[PDB]
Amino acid sequence: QVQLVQSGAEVKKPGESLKISCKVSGYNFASEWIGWVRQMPGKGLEWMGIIYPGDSDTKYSPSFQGQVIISADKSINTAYLQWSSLKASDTAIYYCARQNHYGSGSYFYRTAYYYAMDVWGQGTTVTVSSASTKGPSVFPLAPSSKSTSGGTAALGCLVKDYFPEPVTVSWNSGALTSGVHTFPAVLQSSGLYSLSSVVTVPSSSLGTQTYICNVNHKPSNTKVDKKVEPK
Amino acid sequence: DIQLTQSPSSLSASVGDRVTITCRASQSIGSYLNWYQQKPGKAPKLLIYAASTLQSGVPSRFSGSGSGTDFTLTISSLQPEDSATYYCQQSYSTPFTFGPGTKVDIRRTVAAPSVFIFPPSDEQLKSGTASVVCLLNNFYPREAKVQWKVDNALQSGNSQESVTEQDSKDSTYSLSSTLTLSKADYEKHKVYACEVTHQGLSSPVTKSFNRGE
């Protein structure tokens, strides 16, 4: 199983430098190109560049050359992306992905392989802002014994006043996925984010089953578990 | 660099329909073209490489064809989990540019929202603020309206909404609307209501609660 494990989400002020990493396992890191892909909020994919860890040969998009450096330490299976001075427009999700090669070719001359990004990291969320990191407050969205519709009830957790993105929300340590909706975060006028996660359950499960929302905000190293019950 | 366009930019179709997205490159790139799928909240996944070779673990209903300048990704029998955004990428010469993307939506029967309202928690009240949440769950189509009434007085400028992407299983949407007040203002009023309109409802639905019983 090939796995790319990217560094955690970060917030950094404009002008600051930043280096993020992607740690690889499951194949020979020195033997395939690996690269970086930018995704700005609400936008498509942008190929930034690739590096071949074996000799650290690099190829950049000209839109990113001289603006970022891609490097690698093959002794610890890690690829890096760096900035010298972040701009506000660098706010995005950065993916690190193996640019695998396909097809068969001769050892005795260069071959035009088919290259594709076959395994992707989970992505690193980078936020360029002067605002400081803040952990979330988590509140229950309590189901009621009466606001029950069609034999189903809804409950959830409100995750409020955190910065930067993202938070992740699981239910019962990932055992509960069916009927779960976690909403896109909204930026409040305070400049802090807020979102909700909800789950629909049979009304009969109110009080008898256990619903706990697990909220992770890695930028603050915070993790909150909230039990939700009818009130 | 090589420029790619994709057509259309978004499409909708029914479950079981055959659907095609088209990629066009600024020069001939032979078969040096990949397709990816991105589901909301997820990293992209490789579907096809070398224009037509299907990657292990990808359903047979996905197929790629075309060579040179024009390419098509076909989904033979559209399933609700195919609701996503698709990108082509040329692998002919660096930079290996991605196309702009095509969003695929599932068209399905009309479905009225289930509506739930949630009063603020007592843990929150002790902090200075009061959030009231109205959830509109699993509806279609995406168009809907929420009005907040406090003691029959319509509110404005103190709510925010968020809406999920199309559900991968039943092709519906959901929407949360959050009304924010100070504890003070919240303590001044008794009845809190969210009034919901949708075309799947023969009439506006209203869900309410009375503060402190």
């Binding site: 033997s31 190109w33 071949y52 074996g54 000799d55 040969d57 190829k59 090669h101 070719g105 001769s106 050892y107 005795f108 001359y109 260069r110 071959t111 035009a112 392989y113 290259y115 | 040096y32 692998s91 002919y92 010469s93 660096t94």
Partner: peptide
């Protein structure tokens, strides 16, 4: 560079 893709073949004698 009409054959730039070849620069990515790191698995040859040259």
């Amino acid at each position: 560079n009409e054959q730039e893709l070849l620069e990515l073949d790191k698995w040859a004698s040259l």
